[PDB]
Amino acid sequence: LLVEIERFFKLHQEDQACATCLILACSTCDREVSAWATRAFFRYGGEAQMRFTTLP
Amino acid sequence: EFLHELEEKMEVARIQLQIQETLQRQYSHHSSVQDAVSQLDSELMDITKLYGEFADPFKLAECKLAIIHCAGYSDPILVQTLWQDIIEKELSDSVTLSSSDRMHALSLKIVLLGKIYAGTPRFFPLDFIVQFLEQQVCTLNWDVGFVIQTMNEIGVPLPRLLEVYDQ
């Protein structure tokens, strides 16, 4: 799903997606693309799509 | 000359890969219109075809810019006009809190395209571009060096940046 992670998001939920995203980023032997993308998702979520946030 | 054909091929092929990658991220797309991907993977395409058909309709400004690099299309107005669109599009998505966040994303987007084009002056008029960027970012919180750092990261040399900036 790295390229579309909405599907993961939908089924699993946002929190879980974030957690997995963190693991992929940290995960060792991974391609830079994967780690960077996961880092990007973790940090910024999906641009103009899913936003990453504290809500009152 | 065989080499000539091979390298050009690699370049054009790469573009399709990029366009293909973006198509996945883009949410404007429908899965059933898979046909586009089939077309992309299927073969090398005419540059104009790639430009007119893909870049414009899917508003991939970056791709369009890179493509014109390979084409080596010099026309400054058209090149600049394309740049204006990219910048304008960027503004749309932003919300403000992410001044820093957007700051990074903006630098990220620019640097990537910048690395590819920066070697040639036509797409990357350093002279024209720098102010343009500053002007854009100006309607945002600012830290000095934010604009220039991107160009340095872009691949521009300190010496090149210095003379133009001084000018």
mmCIF file of all heavy atoms in Angstrom, chain B residues 1-61, unseen atoms left out:
data_model
loop_
_atom_site.group_PDB
_atom_site.id
_atom_site.type_symbol
_atom_site.label_atom_id
_atom_site.label_comp_id
_atom_site.label_asym_id
_atom_site.label_seq_id
_atom_site.Cartn_x
_atom_site.Cartn_y
_atom_site.Cartn_z
ATOM 1 N N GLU B 1 25.876 6.783 -31.439
ATOM 2 C CA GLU B 1 24.600 7.306 -31.819
ATOM 3 C C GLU B 1 23.629 6.329 -31.251
ATOM 4 O O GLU B 1 22.518 6.697 -30.872
ATOM 5 C CB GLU B 1 24.405 7.267 -33.340
ATOM 6 N N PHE B 2 24.025 5.050 -31.188
ATOM 7 C CA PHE B 2 23.223 4.075 -30.513
ATOM 8 C C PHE B 2 23.085 4.572 -29.105
ATOM 9 O O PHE B 2 21.999 4.559 -28.528
ATOM 10 C CB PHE B 2 23.924 2.705 -30.475
ATOM 11 N N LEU B 3 24.195 5.062 -28.524
ATOM 12 C CA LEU B 3 24.173 5.552 -27.177
ATOM 13 C C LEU B 3 23.199 6.687 -27.149
ATOM 14 O O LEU B 3 22.416 6.824 -26.213
ATOM 15 C CB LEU B 3 25.566 6.050 -26.722
ATOM 16 N N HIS B 4 23.196 7.525 -28.197
ATOM 17 C CA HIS B 4 22.336 8.672 -28.194
ATOM 18 C C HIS B 4 20.917 8.239 -28.029
ATOM 19 O O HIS B 4 20.194 8.783 -27.195
ATOM 20 C CB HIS B 4 22.414 9.456 -29.517
ATOM 21 N N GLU B 5 20.481 7.236 -28.810
ATOM 22 C CA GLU B 5 19.115 6.805 -28.756
ATOM 23 C C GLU B 5 18.825 6.175 -27.430
ATOM 24 O O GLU B 5 17.744 6.369 -26.877
ATOM 25 C CB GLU B 5 18.766 5.806 -29.875
ATOM 26 N N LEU B 6 19.784 5.405 -26.881
ATOM 27 C CA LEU B 6 19.544 4.696 -25.653
ATOM 28 C C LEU B 6 19.298 5.667 -24.533
ATOM 29 O O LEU B 6 18.324 5.524 -23.795
ATOM 30 C CB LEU B 6 20.739 3.782 -25.284
ATOM 31 N N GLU B 7 20.156 6.695 -24.381
ATOM 32 C CA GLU B 7 20.010 7.599 -23.271
ATOM 33 C C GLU B 7 18.734 8.368 -23.345
ATOM 34 O O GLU B 7 18.064 8.548 -22.328
ATOM 35 C CB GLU B 7 21.177 8.591 -23.102
ATOM 36 N N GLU B 8 18.338 8.828 -24.544
ATOM 37 C CA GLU B 8 17.136 9.608 -24.628
ATOM 38 C C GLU B 8 16.014 8.753 -24.137
ATOM 39 O O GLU B 8 15.132 9.215 -23.416
ATOM 40 C CB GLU B 8 16.781 10.025 -26.065
ATOM 41 N N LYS B 9 16.057 7.462 -24.503
ATOM 42 C CA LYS B 9 15.044 6.505 -24.170
ATOM 43 C C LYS B 9 14.933 6.393 -22.686
ATOM 44 O O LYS B 9 13.835 6.393 -22.131
ATOM 45 C CB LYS B 9 15.434 5.118 -24.677
ATOM 46 N N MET B 10 16.084 6.311 -22.001
ATOM 47 C CA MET B 10 16.077 6.110 -20.585
ATOM 48 C C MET B 10 15.384 7.276 -19.963
ATOM 49 O O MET B 10 14.598 7.120 -19.029
ATOM 50 C CB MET B 10 17.499 6.052 -20.003
ATOM 51 N N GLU B 11 15.657 8.486 -20.479
ATOM 52 C CA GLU B 11 15.104 9.680 -19.913
ATOM 53 C C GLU B 11 13.609 9.679 -20.043
ATOM 54 O O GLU B 11 12.894 9.923 -19.072
ATOM 55 C CB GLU B 11 15.626 10.934 -20.632
ATOM 56 N N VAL B 12 13.092 9.379 -21.250
ATOM 57 C CA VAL B 12 11.675 9.457 -21.468
ATOM 58 C C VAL B 12 10.992 8.395 -20.659
ATOM 59 O O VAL B 12 9.911 8.617 -20.118
ATOM 60 C CB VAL B 12 11.281 9.276 -22.903
ATOM 61 N N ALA B 13 11.613 7.208 -20.563
ATOM 62 C CA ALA B 13 11.014 6.114 -19.848
ATOM 63 C C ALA B 13 10.857 6.512 -18.416
ATOM 64 O O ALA B 13 9.827 6.252 -17.797
ATOM 65 C CB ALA B 13 11.873 4.839 -19.876
ATOM 66 N N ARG B 14 11.874 7.194 -17.863
ATOM 67 C CA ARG B 14 11.877 7.567 -16.480
ATOM 68 C C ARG B 14 10.696 8.443 -16.217
ATOM 69 O O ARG B 14 10.027 8.310 -15.193
ATOM 70 C CB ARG B 14 13.136 8.368 -16.103
ATOM 71 N N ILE B 15 10.392 9.352 -17.159
ATOM 72 C CA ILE B 15 9.322 10.286 -16.962
ATOM 73 C C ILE B 15 8.046 9.529 -16.793
ATOM 74 O O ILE B 15 7.246 9.849 -15.917
ATOM 75 C CB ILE B 15 9.147 11.214 -18.128
ATOM 76 N N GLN B 16 7.827 8.491 -17.616
ATOM 77 C CA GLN B 16 6.596 7.762 -17.533
ATOM 78 C C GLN B 16 6.503 7.131 -16.185
ATOM 79 O O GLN B 16 5.419 7.046 -15.608
ATOM 80 C CB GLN B 16 6.462 6.656 -18.594
ATOM 81 N N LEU B 17 7.641 6.669 -15.641
ATOM 82 C CA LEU B 17 7.613 6.024 -14.363
ATOM 83 C C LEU B 17 7.130 7.032 -13.363
ATOM 84 O O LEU B 17 6.323 6.710 -12.492
ATOM 85 C CB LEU B 17 9.011 5.512 -13.944
ATOM 86 N N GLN B 18 7.615 8.285 -13.459
ATOM 87 C CA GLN B 18 7.233 9.294 -12.508
ATOM 88 C C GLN B 18 5.768 9.574 -12.638
ATOM 89 O O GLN B 18 5.047 9.631 -11.643
ATOM 90 C CB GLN B 18 7.975 10.624 -12.725
ATOM 91 N N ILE B 19 5.281 9.720 -13.884
ATOM 92 C CA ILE B 19 3.901 10.039 -14.106
ATOM 93 C C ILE B 19 3.095 8.917 -13.548
ATOM 94 O O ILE B 19 2.054 9.125 -12.930
ATOM 95 C CB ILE B 19 3.555 10.147 -15.563
ATOM 96 N N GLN B 20 3.572 7.682 -13.762
ATOM 97 C CA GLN B 20 2.859 6.524 -13.326
ATOM 98 C C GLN B 20 2.759 6.543 -11.830
ATOM 99 O O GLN B 20 1.703 6.260 -11.269
ATOM 100 C CB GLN B 20 3.570 5.226 -13.750
ATOM 101 N N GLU B 21 3.856 6.910 -11.142
ATOM 102 C CA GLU B 21 3.867 6.887 -9.708
ATOM 103 C C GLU B 21 2.872 7.868 -9.171
ATOM 104 O O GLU B 21 2.155 7.570 -8.216
ATOM 105 C CB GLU B 21 5.239 7.255 -9.116
ATOM 106 N N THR B 22 2.797 9.068 -9.781
ATOM 107 C CA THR B 22 1.931 10.108 -9.300
ATOM 108 C C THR B 22 0.501 9.701 -9.464
ATOM 109 O O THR B 22 -0.345 10.017 -8.628
ATOM 110 C CB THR B 22 2.115 11.422 -9.997
ATOM 111 N N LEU B 23 0.197 8.960 -10.544
ATOM 112 C CA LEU B 23 -1.149 8.576 -10.851
ATOM 113 C C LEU B 23 -1.663 7.803 -9.676
ATOM 114 O O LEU B 23 -2.837 7.913 -9.325
ATOM 115 C CB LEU B 23 -1.206 7.712 -12.131
ATOM 116 N N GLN B 24 -0.802 6.991 -9.038
ATOM 117 C CA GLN B 24 -1.254 6.207 -7.923
ATOM 118 C C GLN B 24 -1.682 7.121 -6.815
ATOM 119 O O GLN B 24 -2.769 6.965 -6.260
ATOM 120 C CB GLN B 24 -0.139 5.323 -7.352
ATOM 121 N N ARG B 25 -0.841 8.119 -6.477
ATOM 122 C CA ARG B 25 -1.116 8.998 -5.376
ATOM 123 C C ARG B 25 -2.327 9.825 -5.668
ATOM 124 O O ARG B 25 -3.168 10.033 -4.794
ATOM 125 C CB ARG B 25 0.036 9.971 -5.079
ATOM 126 N N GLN B 26 -2.459 10.303 -6.917
ATOM 127 C CA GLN B 26 -3.536 11.180 -7.262
ATOM 128 C C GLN B 26 -4.829 10.502 -6.930
ATOM 129 O O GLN B 26 -4.982 9.297 -7.117
ATOM 130 C CB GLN B 26 -3.540 11.562 -8.754
ATOM 131 N N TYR B 27 -5.794 11.282 -6.397
ATOM 132 C CA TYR B 27 -7.052 10.737 -5.970
ATOM 133 C C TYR B 27 -8.097 11.160 -6.959
ATOM 134 O O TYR B 27 -9.272 10.816 -6.833
ATOM 135 C CB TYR B 27 -7.423 11.312 -4.585
ATOM 136 N N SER B 28 -7.682 11.900 -8.000
ATOM 137 C CA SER B 28 -8.592 12.352 -9.013
ATOM 138 C C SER B 28 -8.884 11.210 -9.941
ATOM 139 O O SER B 28 -9.852 11.246 -10.699
ATOM 140 C CB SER B 28 -8.016 13.508 -9.850
ATOM 141 N N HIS B 29 -8.040 10.162 -9.882
ATOM 142 C CA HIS B 29 -8.069 9.054 -10.795
ATOM 143 C C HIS B 29 -9.026 7.999 -10.334
ATOM 144 O O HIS B 29 -9.386 7.912 -9.161
ATOM 145 C CB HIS B 29 -6.674 8.420 -10.903
ATOM 146 N N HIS B 30 -9.484 7.169 -11.294
ATOM 147 C CA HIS B 30 -10.360 6.069 -11.016
ATOM 148 C C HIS B 30 -9.582 4.823 -11.304
ATOM 149 O O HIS B 30 -8.777 4.779 -12.231
ATOM 150 C CB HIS B 30 -11.628 6.073 -11.887
ATOM 151 N N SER B 31 -9.788 3.772 -10.491
ATOM 152 C CA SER B 31 -9.024 2.569 -10.653
ATOM 153 C C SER B 31 -9.335 1.946 -11.974
ATOM 154 O O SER B 31 -8.448 1.417 -12.642
ATOM 155 C CB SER B 31 -9.313 1.516 -9.568
ATOM 156 N N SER B 32 -10.604 2.011 -12.405
ATOM 157 C CA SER B 32 -10.956 1.355 -13.628
ATOM 158 C C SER B 32 -10.257 2.018 -14.769
ATOM 159 O O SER B 32 -10.014 1.373 -15.787
ATOM 160 C CB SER B 32 -12.460 1.354 -13.935
ATOM 161 N N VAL B 33 -9.923 3.324 -14.671
ATOM 162 C CA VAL B 33 -9.203 3.877 -15.784
ATOM 163 C C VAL B 33 -7.763 3.500 -15.600
ATOM 164 O O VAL B 33 -6.859 4.334 -15.530
ATOM 165 C CB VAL B 33 -9.327 5.377 -15.919
ATOM 166 N N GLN B 34 -7.541 2.178 -15.531
ATOM 167 C CA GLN B 34 -6.293 1.489 -15.402
ATOM 168 C C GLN B 34 -5.602 1.631 -16.711
ATOM 169 O O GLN B 34 -4.382 1.529 -16.814
ATOM 170 C CB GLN B 34 -6.506 -0.001 -15.089
ATOM 171 N N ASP B 35 -6.402 1.892 -17.753
ATOM 172 C CA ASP B 35 -5.952 1.921 -19.109
ATOM 173 C C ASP B 35 -4.773 2.832 -19.188
ATOM 174 O O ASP B 35 -3.820 2.556 -19.914
ATOM 175 C CB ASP B 35 -7.027 2.501 -20.039
ATOM 176 N N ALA B 36 -4.792 3.940 -18.430
ATOM 177 C CA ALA B 36 -3.688 4.847 -18.513
ATOM 178 C C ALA B 36 -2.433 4.146 -18.087
ATOM 179 O O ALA B 36 -1.405 4.264 -18.750
ATOM 180 C CB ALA B 36 -3.857 6.077 -17.609
ATOM 181 N N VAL B 37 -2.476 3.371 -16.984
ATOM 182 C CA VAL B 37 -1.255 2.757 -16.539
ATOM 183 C C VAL B 37 -0.798 1.792 -17.581
ATOM 184 O O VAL B 37 0.392 1.703 -17.877
ATOM 185 C CB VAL B 37 -1.351 2.013 -15.232
ATOM 186 N N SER B 38 -1.746 1.059 -18.193
ATOM 187 C CA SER B 38 -1.374 0.072 -19.161
ATOM 188 C C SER B 38 -0.637 0.774 -20.250
ATOM 189 O O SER B 38 0.353 0.268 -20.775
ATOM 190 C CB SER B 38 -2.584 -0.627 -19.804
ATOM 191 N N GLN B 39 -1.110 1.977 -20.616
ATOM 192 C CA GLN B 39 -0.492 2.725 -21.670
ATOM 193 C C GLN B 39 0.886 3.127 -21.248
ATOM 194 O O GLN B 39 1.822 3.066 -22.042
ATOM 195 C CB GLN B 39 -1.260 4.013 -22.019
ATOM 196 N N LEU B 40 1.043 3.547 -19.979
ATOM 197 C CA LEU B 40 2.307 4.046 -19.518
ATOM 198 C C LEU B 40 3.352 2.972 -19.531
ATOM 199 O O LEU B 40 4.446 3.171 -20.054
ATOM 200 C CB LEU B 40 2.225 4.599 -18.086
ATOM 201 N N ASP B 41 3.040 1.796 -18.957
ATOM 202 C CA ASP B 41 3.993 0.728 -18.863
ATOM 203 C C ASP B 41 4.257 0.152 -20.220
ATOM 204 O O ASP B 41 5.356 -0.328 -20.502
ATOM 205 C CB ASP B 41 3.536 -0.402 -17.919
ATOM 206 N N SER B 42 3.238 0.191 -21.096
ATOM 207 C CA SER B 42 3.260 -0.468 -22.368
ATOM 208 C C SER B 42 4.326 0.037 -23.288
ATOM 209 O O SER B 42 4.940 -0.763 -23.988
ATOM 210 C CB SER B 42 1.915 -0.340 -23.109
ATOM 211 N N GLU B 43 4.590 1.356 -23.349
ATOM 212 C CA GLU B 43 5.570 1.738 -24.332
ATOM 213 C C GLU B 43 6.017 3.139 -24.088
ATOM 214 O O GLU B 43 5.475 3.844 -23.240
ATOM 215 C CB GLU B 43 5.004 1.686 -25.759
ATOM 216 N N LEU B 44 7.059 3.560 -24.835
ATOM 217 C CA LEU B 44 7.560 4.903 -24.759
ATOM 218 C C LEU B 44 6.547 5.725 -25.492
ATOM 219 O O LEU B 44 5.878 5.218 -26.390
ATOM 220 C CB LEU B 44 8.918 5.074 -25.460
ATOM 221 N N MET B 45 6.377 7.011 -25.129
ATOM 222 C CA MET B 45 5.346 7.764 -25.784
ATOM 223 C C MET B 45 5.931 9.027 -26.316
ATOM 224 O O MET B 45 7.038 9.426 -25.957
ATOM 225 C CB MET B 45 4.202 8.180 -24.846
ATOM 226 N N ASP B 46 5.176 9.687 -27.213
ATOM 227 C CA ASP B 46 5.624 10.918 -27.785
ATOM 228 C C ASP B 46 5.665 11.907 -26.670
ATOM 229 O O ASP B 46 4.847 11.864 -25.754
ATOM 230 C CB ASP B 46 4.671 11.458 -28.867
ATOM 231 N N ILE B 47 6.649 12.825 -26.720
ATOM 232 C CA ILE B 47 6.794 13.794 -25.680
ATOM 233 C C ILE B 47 5.578 14.663 -25.666
ATOM 234 O O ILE B 47 5.003 14.922 -24.611
ATOM 235 C CB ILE B 47 8.023 14.658 -25.840
ATOM 236 N N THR B 48 5.122 15.106 -26.851
ATOM 237 C CA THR B 48 3.977 15.964 -26.895
ATOM 238 C C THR B 48 2.820 15.200 -26.352
ATOM 239 O O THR B 48 1.989 15.749 -25.631
ATOM 240 C CB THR B 48 3.622 16.429 -28.282
ATOM 241 N N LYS B 49 2.745 13.903 -26.684
ATOM 242 C CA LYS B 49 1.658 13.091 -26.232
ATOM 243 C C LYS B 49 1.700 13.046 -24.742
ATOM 244 O O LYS B 49 0.674 13.196 -24.078
ATOM 245 C CB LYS B 49 1.770 11.651 -26.764
ATOM 246 N N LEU B 50 2.906 12.855 -24.171
ATOM 247 C CA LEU B 50 3.026 12.776 -22.744
ATOM 248 C C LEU B 50 2.632 14.086 -22.151
ATOM 249 O O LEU B 50 1.909 14.133 -21.160
ATOM 250 C CB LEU B 50 4.467 12.484 -22.279
ATOM 251 N N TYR B 51 3.115 15.189 -22.744
ATOM 252 C CA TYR B 51 2.846 16.494 -22.217
ATOM 253 C C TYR B 51 1.396 16.847 -22.312
ATOM 254 O O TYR B 51 0.743 17.112 -21.304
ATOM 255 C CB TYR B 51 3.637 17.554 -23.007
ATOM 256 N N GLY B 52 0.841 16.815 -23.537
ATOM 257 C CA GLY B 52 -0.505 17.264 -23.716
ATOM 258 C C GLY B 52 -1.471 16.345 -23.056
ATOM 259 O O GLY B 52 -2.388 16.783 -22.366
ATOM 260 N N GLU B 53 -1.310 15.034 -23.284
ATOM 261 C CA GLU B 53 -2.282 14.134 -22.751
ATOM 262 C C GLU B 53 -2.186 14.018 -21.259
ATOM 263 O O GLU B 53 -3.187 14.153 -20.561
ATOM 264 C CB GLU B 53 -2.155 12.733 -23.368
ATOM 265 N N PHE B 54 -0.994 13.690 -20.724
ATOM 266 C CA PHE B 54 -0.877 13.465 -19.308
ATOM 267 C C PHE B 54 -0.675 14.664 -18.424
ATOM 268 O O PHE B 54 -1.462 14.920 -17.513
ATOM 269 C CB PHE B 54 0.243 12.464 -19.017
ATOM 270 N N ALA B 55 0.376 15.462 -18.701
ATOM 271 C CA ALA B 55 0.791 16.473 -17.768
ATOM 272 C C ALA B 55 -0.255 17.516 -17.583
ATOM 273 O O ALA B 55 -0.533 17.918 -16.454
ATOM 274 C CB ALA B 55 2.081 17.192 -18.205
ATOM 275 N N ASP B 56 -0.841 18.005 -18.689
ATOM 276 C CA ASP B 56 -1.800 19.062 -18.569
ATOM 277 C C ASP B 56 -3.077 18.578 -17.947
ATOM 278 O O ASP B 56 -3.577 19.203 -17.013
ATOM 279 C CB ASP B 56 -2.117 19.745 -19.915
ATOM 280 N N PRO B 57 -3.633 17.482 -18.396
ATOM 281 C CA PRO B 57 -4.882 17.060 -17.832
ATOM 282 C C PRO B 57 -4.750 16.621 -16.419
ATOM 283 O O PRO B 57 -5.733 16.703 -15.684
ATOM 284 C CB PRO B 57 -5.439 15.996 -18.774
ATOM 285 N N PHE B 58 -3.564 16.136 -16.011
ATOM 286 C CA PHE B 58 -3.484 15.708 -14.653
ATOM 287 C C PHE B 58 -2.721 16.733 -13.880
ATOM 288 O O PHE B 58 -2.343 16.506 -12.732
ATOM 289 C CB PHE B 58 -2.777 14.356 -14.473
ATOM 290 N N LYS B 59 -2.496 17.904 -14.499
ATOM 291 C CA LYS B 59 -1.883 19.005 -13.821
ATOM 292 C C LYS B 59 -0.603 18.581 -13.170
ATOM 293 O O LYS B 59 -0.283 19.051 -12.078
ATOM 294 C CB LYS B 59 -2.810 19.610 -12.750
ATOM 295 N N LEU B 60 0.185 17.687 -13.796
ATOM 296 C CA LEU B 60 1.440 17.417 -13.156
ATOM 297 C C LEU B 60 2.379 18.438 -13.696
ATOM 298 O O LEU B 60 2.969 18.260 -14.760
ATOM 299 C CB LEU B 60 2.083 16.055 -13.474
ATOM 300 N N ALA B 61 2.518 19.557 -12.966
ATOM 301 C CA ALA B 61 3.359 20.635 -13.382
ATOM 302 C C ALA B 61 4.798 20.222 -13.359
ATOM 303 O O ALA B 61 5.567 20.599 -14.240
ATOM 304 C CB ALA B 61 3.214 21.882 -12.497
#
